[PDB]
Design a protein around this ligand. Structure first.
Ligand SMILES: CCn1c(-c2cc(N3CCN(C4CC4)CC3)cnc2[C@H](C)OC)c2c3cc(ccc31)-c1csc(n1)C[C@H](NC(=O)[C@H]1[C@@H]3COC[C@@H]31)C(=O)N1CCC[C@H](N1)C(=O)OCC(C)(C)C2
Ligand SMILES: CCn1c(-c2cc(N3CCN(C4CC4)CC3)cnc2[C@H](C)OC)c2c3cc(ccc31)-c1csc(n1)C[C@H](NC(=O)[C@H]1[C@@H]3COC[C@@H]31)C(=O)N1CCC[C@H](N1)C(=O)OCC(C)(C)C2
Ligand SMILES: Nc1nc2c(ncn2[C@@H]2O[C@H](COP(=O)(O)OP(=O)(O)O)[C@@H](O)[C@H]2O)c(=O)[nH]1
Ligand SMILES: Nc1nc2c(ncn2[C@@H]2O[C@H](COP(=O)(O)OP(=O)(O)O)[C@@H](O)[C@H]2O)c(=O)[nH]1
Ligand SMILES: [Mg+2]
Ligand SMILES: [Mg+2]
Lengths: 167, 163, 163, 168
């Protein structure tokens, strides 16, 4: 039987977590804002010649519920830590996310991938070097995506699966 | 020669594509004839208009409840249920067409199409066909499934018949 | 004086019961008038025919999207959005009626009815009413909610108006 | 807020786990057989004057999937162990379920209630004192129920919640 991979998409609100997930699962774009309470998806794929089953938890970034992320981090295998290229606070929030997962699962080597969505945007506030810098300290990759054109969507999720296989 | 049937699949009323199946009348003539007759609707009832009520990515797509349209019903052309014809054929991989049931000798009209190998169903579900054309339609149907099978859109057999 | 409005709730088209609300026009006259006018439809649009798209047992029932009917739309009688009027009233318990939003000063027509105390929403959503009669109908609506709010049946406002 | 209780309904296929749960949640009796894959429900109730939130997992009794009960047994807080009073085999399956839950939870003290369902049916094969004896030997309560008449439906779930509170 094919292996199952439990991926968790995290990040602040409106950064595009659902827009990325729906593009992967449904191959269409959600232009309207439908804020997520919590959603789960299933998708079978071939990554590097192996058929595998992706279990994807799409989470809510509302700060009021930041104390409740412990449960889904204890069950998840890999984490797609999403900020937006035009949201400085979302960049600063990634530290609390990583420290949460480190403490929840009791490890410093947890598969993660940094995703900078809204690459198509005609603005910016977060540079790519600082992304790769924090990524080089944790030991994780970085991918720029756009759910409107589907750029980098497949790459983002597949890189995280490859990171789980190493652990 | 084995008969061929087609489904025209629609998603929330929008056409998705045609799937065709070869039915193994040479190995399971009674089970194949049931599915063939229900596809044409020649007995006055059948699959046209019914939905796929359970789709689980990585495993299968299940449909065929045309009497209650809620996953509990369906009927064969020999009565509400009929016996297990044989278990010669196995669930060897994607595209396999096989009969759903609620235990031994409870074949009605509900069927399922594998999207992977489901070998632990061998000897428990009668395999009677395989996808001939349009496997990618079946694969596209997976995107509307879920872990427990509930579908996010209404997947219907908008039309069906024998080729 | 505080006006009183009513919803006649249906489940899959079958009538369920009437819920009435007192609208605190004495504390939030602008927010109360928006809900009152949308309940009567006197502006040419309103809640009649729309559904409760989110029901989370133990917390609240949310509805009010009559423009898109998917939980992302709605509009007020003052335009697409209007400002938070004040936060005098708090989410003190079951039956509280309050404005949904997507950030500060994005009130439209979406609302929610509390089925328990939700004090972490105080200062963030404008409370403007409370269930007067028919709290049992709101409790009955919870039979079709879920953990993330997806409803298992279609819960609609079949009729609404002012008492 | 109110306390949330993670309840799991277990037992052989066709004993009425889903019928019991839907009666609790929707006050409606499903007379048709819709075999469960997995389903979760929520309901707020008042038990002994305190409001709480029931989270109920409806499980699959198929024996082919018995080695896959591990994850839901680890997260569940209390277990409704259902057999049907007209199905001797389902009563015998109860022992295997309890042994699993003990083995998965690494404990002899797990909140559990034994439920004999379908007590409206005229021809039982398991006698009430027989299930009472097994419940006593387990140190857990026993309740006879009917998802058809609603007899003991609220009682079974509420007694499970009371068992969990004492476990605290
Ligand atoms: C434990 C969870 N779990 C799984 C499962 C299992 C696995 N694997 C098992 C195999 N291992 C490999 C060798 C190692 C690896 C781990 C992974 N993840 C899962 C899922 C997603 O966890 C939520 C299943 C499964 C199936 C049932 C109940 C629970 C199940 C179930 C109930 S009734 C039935 N099955 C037969 C049913 N009958 C009716 O519908 C009746 C209705 C009324 O009367 C006419 C009509 C029927 O005929 N079919 C037609 C055929 C496929 C079949 N439905 C179905 O849907 O199975 C789904 C699924 C996912 C393939 C199996
Ligand atoms: C972490 C899980 N989780 C919870 C939650 C929390 C708790 N508690 C928190 C409080 N602790 C107390 C100190 C002890 C105990 C533990 C327990 N279990 C849960 C749930 C069931 O786990 C799945 C929630 C919650 C809420 C959101 C996202 C995730 C959430 C969310 C997204 S957007 C929004 N919220 C505002 C939204 N905006 C729009 O809809 C916009 C759309 C587009 O433009 C117009 C239109 C809006 O106005 N409302 C109207 C108001 C109630 C609100 N929706 C809603 O539904 O929240 C539900 C809920 C359950 C009350 C909160
Ligand atoms: N320009 C642009 N907007 C995006 C992109 N991805 C998401 N958005 C917008 O960001 C808003 C919020 O998206 P959402 O998926 O709900 O983010 P989430 O709250 O983290 O799940 C939506 O209006 C989306 O249209 C993107 O790649 N480019
Ligand atoms: N007469 C009677 N029938 C019941 C009762 N509970 C369940 N049933 C029936 O038994 C069958 C199986 O019920 P179900 O809940 O789906 O079994 P499950 O696999 O344990 O979930 C259904 O047709 C139900 O209608 C009951 O208390 N009394
Ligand atoms: Mg989202
Ligand atoms: Mg069941």
């Amino acid at each position: 039987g094919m292996t199952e991979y439990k991926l968790v998409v995290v990040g602040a609100c409106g950064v595009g977590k659902s827009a990325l997930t729906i593009q992967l699962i449904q191959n269409h774009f959600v232009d309207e804002y439908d804020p997520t309470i919590e959603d789960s998806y299933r998708k079978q794929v071939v990554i590097d010649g192996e058929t595998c089953l992706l279990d994807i938890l799409d989470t809510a970034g509302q700060e009021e519920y930041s104390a409740m992320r412990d449960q889904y981090m204890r069950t998840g295998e890999g984490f797609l830590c999403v900020f937006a290229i035009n949201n400085t606070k979302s960049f600063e929030d990634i530290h609390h996310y990583r420290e949460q997962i480190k403490r929840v699962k009791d490890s410093e080597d947890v598969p993660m991938v940094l995703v900078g969505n809204k690459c198509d945007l005609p603005s910016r506030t977060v540079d790519t070097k600082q992304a790769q810098d924090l990524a080089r300290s944790y030991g994780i990759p970085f991918i720029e995506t756009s759910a409107k054109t589907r750029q980098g969507v497949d790459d983002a999720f597949y890189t995280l699966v490859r990171e789980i296989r190493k652990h | 020669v084995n008969p061929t049937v087609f489904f025209d699949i629609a998603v929330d009323g929008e056409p998705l594509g045609r799937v065709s199946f070869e039915l193994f009348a040479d190995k399971v003539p009674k089970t194949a004839e049931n599915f063939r007759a229900l596809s044409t609707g020649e007995k006055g009832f059948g699959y046209k208009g019914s939905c796929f009520h359970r789709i689980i990515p990585g495993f299968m797509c299940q449909g065929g409840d045309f009497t209650r349209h809620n996953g509990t019903g369906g009927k064969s052309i020999y009565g509400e249920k009929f016996e297990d014809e044989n278990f010669i054929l196995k669930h060897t991989g994607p595209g396999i067409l096989s009969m759903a049931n609620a235990g031994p000798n409870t074949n009605g009209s509900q069927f399922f199409i594998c999207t992977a190998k489901t070998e632990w169903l061998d000897g428990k579900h009668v395999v009677f066909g395989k996808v001939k054309e349009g496997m990618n339609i079946v694969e596209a149907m997976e995107r509307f499934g879920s872990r427990n099978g509930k579908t996010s859109k209404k997947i219907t057999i908008a039309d069906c018949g024998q080729l």
